[PDB]
Amino acid sequence: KNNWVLLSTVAAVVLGITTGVLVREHSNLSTLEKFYFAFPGEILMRMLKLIILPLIISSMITGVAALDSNVSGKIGLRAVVYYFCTTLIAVILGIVLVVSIKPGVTQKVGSTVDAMLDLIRNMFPENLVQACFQQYKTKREEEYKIVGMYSDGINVLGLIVFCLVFGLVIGKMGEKGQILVDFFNALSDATMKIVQIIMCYMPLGILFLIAGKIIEVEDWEIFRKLGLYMATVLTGLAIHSIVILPLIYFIVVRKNPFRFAMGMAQALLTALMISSSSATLPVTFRCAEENNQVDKRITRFVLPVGATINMDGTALYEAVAAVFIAQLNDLDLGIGQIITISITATSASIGAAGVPQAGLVTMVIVLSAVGLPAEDVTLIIAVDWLLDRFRTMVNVLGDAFGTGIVEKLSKKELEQMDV
Template identity: 55%
Template sequence: MVNKHVQNQNQAPEVVRLVVPPRPVQHSDGGPLTLKERLKRCRPEMNADNLLLVLTILGVIVGIALGSVLRFANLGPTEKHLIQYPGEILMRMLKMMVLPLIVSSLISGLAQLDAKESGKMGSWALLYYFSTTMIAAIIGIVMVVSIRPGANTARDAAIQKGEEKEVSTLDAILDLIRNVFPDNLVQACFRNDETIYKIVPNKAYNASVNGSEPTIRVRSLILKDGMNVLGLITFSIGFGTILGAMGPEGQVMTNFFFVLNEIIMRFVKLIIWYSPIGIACLISGKILEVENIADTARMLGMYMVTVLCGLAFHAIIVLPGIYFAVTRKNPWTFFRGMLQAWVMALGTASSAATLPLTFRCLEENNNVDKRVTRFVLPIGATINMDGTALYEAVAAIFIAQLNRMELTWGQIITVSLTATAASVGAASVPSAGLVTMLLVLTSLGLPTSDVTYIVAVDWMLDRIRTSINVLGDAFGAGIVHHLCKADLDKIDEEVIKEIGEQALSPLSPMSPFDPFRRMSTHLEVNYEGAIERRRSVRRSLRRDHRSPQELRETQSRDLNGLAVNSYQPIPNSEEHSPAGDADTGI
């Protein structure tokens, strides 16, 4: 035994390798996964949004190919109508959702702003949101009026020469204000007011002059078919603001509109799944109707250039300029901290899907207070749509130019206001701008079927304008944090003072001078941290990027460091000896 022991000591120790068999992947109920389910887990990137994007692109390609081939078939009007019919059904379904969508989105979004509780933070956030959205709409109008992507100079000149129409700017502005405040809310759902001039005989003269009867122009107010979008938006904004100010008294009505908005959102998502078929039929039908394909392709190219130039100007000049003017900080450093969320917005085309990552970038990279981000970002994802407002303003005037329609100043003002308000009600889901686009077209009396022209390129522009929306939300949170930082610090000081007064009492259950209390608190924090680590995997699947380390640090700071570090320990206290701290591990 001794020789064997000595021999074992002289030999090199043998390396023992434990081979642990891989744990089979199982269901939550314990059963093994099938091959089909394993394949699904191997490609998690093919989610519903990406599948819808692929189908939409395929619909555009199929529509272009089908329309190009059928142009050589010399189809009659009936055949062309049947080809466009599925697209007509799509447009009717989208128009059906316009009214409930704008009302429920506006009311549910504004009801979250309680003026009594949010105070200064909510006021600054609303001012920033509506200001930047209006600026974006104005930039879009300036771009499209200057570049004129849908205009053909020769044809426009001929039409303008033959049509000398006198338009009163004063009447257009008065009609705009009149429609903002409708006298009948139900009637505003399908009609709006318009001033016209009628030629009537002048009864003041009984005899005709030179064989002709004298006439005069009389102003008359008529009801024109079409939804009064401005009136409905005004009512919804007022309703939502007052509802949010009521607090607990209006909670029942607030919950009703939240549920209604969720129902409409799900309804819209179902309709969007039908959109690839409708888009293919609409595009093929429009190709059959277009006389000159080359001119149309050139106009769409100029339209894309116009939108991209406007979005680039807003993202590079306007938003960083406002941030620097208010905070006096480097906006590009702030943008670098938001780069990950910006890239994700390009991929998902959804402000809501990017929201968890936006929280993380603002709080961890740019050090924005969580109270600001948790208040500002959810509201911003609903009502702050800078890119959408710019896009809708450009698209509406582009369609007006395609129809050889010269807009008056009153109509241009209507475009800016309607695009701003419609973007406020735009859902934070992919391609929601196409739905709210119908609001702007309806306010101008333009044919909604012409939205087909921009559908072919909307899948790409949708991602770019969504990234601008997310960037606008982020800059807004940074500005609100800068403006409200003094108030937030004051609240923190009051909380620390209140906790400290409670902790000074040795008999207080929150006293930090009790070693058993400190030990139990420390163990409780560690236990909560362990539980949080176990739950972090599940939470990551739901795109919640809050880390367990963040929770542990927050709890440790609040429970141990806040009161203990703010006050000196009692002299000659056994509980606060270095050995006592070492024993408790604090």
């Protein structure tokens, strides 16, 4: 006998790939019947979006309140240093692989500052209740006048920053704020038993979410016409996730880095099918502390920050595809043009959201920094549901890897706290 959570997810990926392929050659469903066929996949998607509001709020508060305000200053320093030393590696390895393969040659025919100041405008929102379901976006229009309105989508960057300050303030209050530690420890425990309820619906939801995703129009543009560009994204996503990311784990932890990746198989295959790192963040919490036994004082702090900051698969896909877009023209892309690609792609992966297809929002930022037009992204929009699924597994794995690396780097400080 074995565990039924992972063996039924693998059985639902197989039964969902073989369903969304067979119904195309056999039948011809209309545009309205292809939306009701993926309806159990939509219910799973909005059941996971539902739970990230009490999960991020309660884990960010009790993750920092359990540390005595100077241990948390070094867990926070060893997290941002790790996130910068993997994003830059995933950018550089995607830069080297895209100018040596050269996928874009002889196949051509076939508001950056306003987007970066919206990261700081979203870290300090004007309302806490409005930050739970609405984001702030700035447009420039008329000699121009800056005017911003409130769009939709949960402001995850503003709830992390406020609960980090709320977590530090509560932990320094002592006995005067002990009832707020017990409230958000009982809330983080109650909204992890709900994740174990959604995890029983997940094989039935994936089986229709991935069958209604490969049910699309043309399998020829993804395969051969835009071919050998996906052989630079998936190649860079392979070497970074199989070789490089279990080499950063093996250097600082001598504890078998593929035993950690095998123990995170539920969170890896969830993001491989739902294509959103923020929505699978409840799966990453459960599949790390229960399987790999990484300490709860670190995963409550490292994993929510890494889900919206550390996005290595997006950082490699930004550095590969923006050069490939410039390679469809006859641009030289000299030594000055390479480094400015590698700089804004590090910031675009930071500014990218954990929503599905957030990959093409921040592609305008890196493309306009090199001089390419924004409407030259329309060549990439065709195959984006498949390249978004492999760059979310890597993003999730990177976050999972961080929990184990920061824990061995701070084994003394966790053992410092005693009775």
